[PDB]
Amino acid sequence: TCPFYKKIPGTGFTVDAFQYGVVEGCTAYFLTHFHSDHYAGLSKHFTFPVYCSEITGNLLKNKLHVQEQYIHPLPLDTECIVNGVKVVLLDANHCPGAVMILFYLPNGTVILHTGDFRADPSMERSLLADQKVHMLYLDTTYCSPEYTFPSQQEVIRFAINTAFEAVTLNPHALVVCGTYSIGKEKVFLAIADVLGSKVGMSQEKYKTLQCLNIPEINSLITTDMCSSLVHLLPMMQINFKGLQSHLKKCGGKYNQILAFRPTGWTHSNKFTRIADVIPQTKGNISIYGIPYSEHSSYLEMKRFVQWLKPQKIIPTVNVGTWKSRSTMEKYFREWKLEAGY
Ligand code: NI
Known part of the structure; x- marks a missing residue:
């Protein structure tokens, strides 16, 4: 009822x-x-x-x-x-x-x-x-x-600077961003824009994004993963096992992954500023949890x-x-x- x-x-x-x-x-x-x-x-x-x-x-x-x-x-x-x-x-x-x-x-x-x-x-x-x-x-x-969490603008600044530094140091790094529903598109669009890449994703996710009236979208997204160095994956696959496996599929194009999980709030907010955020790292894979909130x-x-x-x-x-x-x-x-x- x-x-x-x-x-x-x-x-x-x-x-x-x-x-x-x-x-x-x-x-x-x-x-x-x-x-x-x-x-x-x-x-x-x-x-x-x-x-x-x-x-x-x-x-x-x-x-x-x-x-x-x-x-x-x-x-x-x-x-x-x-x-x-x-x-x-x-x-x-x-x-x-x-x-x-x-x-x-x-x-x-x-x-x-x-x-x-x-x-x-x-x-x-x-x-x-x-x-x-x-x-x-x-x-x-x-x-x-x-x-408490920072503005969306400060969080995007952190992400763009992080991705741009990583790929400039190593042109063979892949950037991955997690998603499970609509929202938070600025994360993966801002990173693709600083790197001069389109964002690569599944046909199902591309279809979803084409429904959104975002101007110049055909310019920023694609289903051709091979031409893209920013890939979107399901949020569930943003872990060391899921990302290791993805990296295998890229056929030696890449030798490092930098991944982002936009979350809402996490308790690392009560003690740490955005500037101070650090990743979890295992081998050639780093995962950043970034406090991008839509509430x-x-x-x-x-x-x-x-x-x-x-x-x-x-x-x-x-x-x-x-x-x-x-x-x-x-x-x-x-x-x-x-x-x-
Ligand atoms: Ni909602």
Whole structure:
């Protein structure tokens, strides 16, 4: 059965709720982004209306074979009417095609559902600036002060400088980057760009990337692995065994691998700066775990909510334990007392 925090009161709508069969009284199903915990349940046999971004719609049609007649893409930053209710889709600064959804209820209540997001001060100047929000359905993934990580720009600087140094010292080094879903494409695109290479990958992953409207993409990616010195592999294969085996397949073209695992947060964050990050090394293989996050840090999340001043917050992540819920509720009260709303 569909949980309460995926239902929007006073509407026919649910958010990210495709794994519960036919939801009682749901007339339209919204999908914030194409990540499997959120899309779980969609396929060619789905015959209710799905509302989403253009990019999410490309992925529904091409990757899951949802029929075109049930896909309703909306433009961003544009007031739209859906089953008699005004909505707006806003950029979530998560993975490509990810949105937040503003709902303008017929009784006058305004609700923001963030989906998954990385809060940013640029959001303080979207269509959010222009009215009060009563209820916030919040991505609370890292809602605890231990969760600090650097900006995405500092992390990309580290990666480009690391890769460029390694390959300049040894022109026979291969760079590998791990992936398992959409998101974090800047990691492998920035490295390929500094090295003057395209990124090589499987046909299935190339197809996924062609759905994303990334400009000049035919220029940066390829399925010809032989012509590429930046390769993408499944995240599961980013270990010494998996990488040793890959290196065998390259036929003596290469004699060293430098690999990157973008993670979210890891506890090496609490003690070490990005500048100071070091790899795990075995023989001719080095693996860097780099803290490239597509979710809000605690301080980014706090700043957003203190700016927005919602009357009620409904967490959508970490809701399964009493200890987690209690912790999050205590931070929301601090934030409200400190800011005066
Ligand atoms: Ni996500």
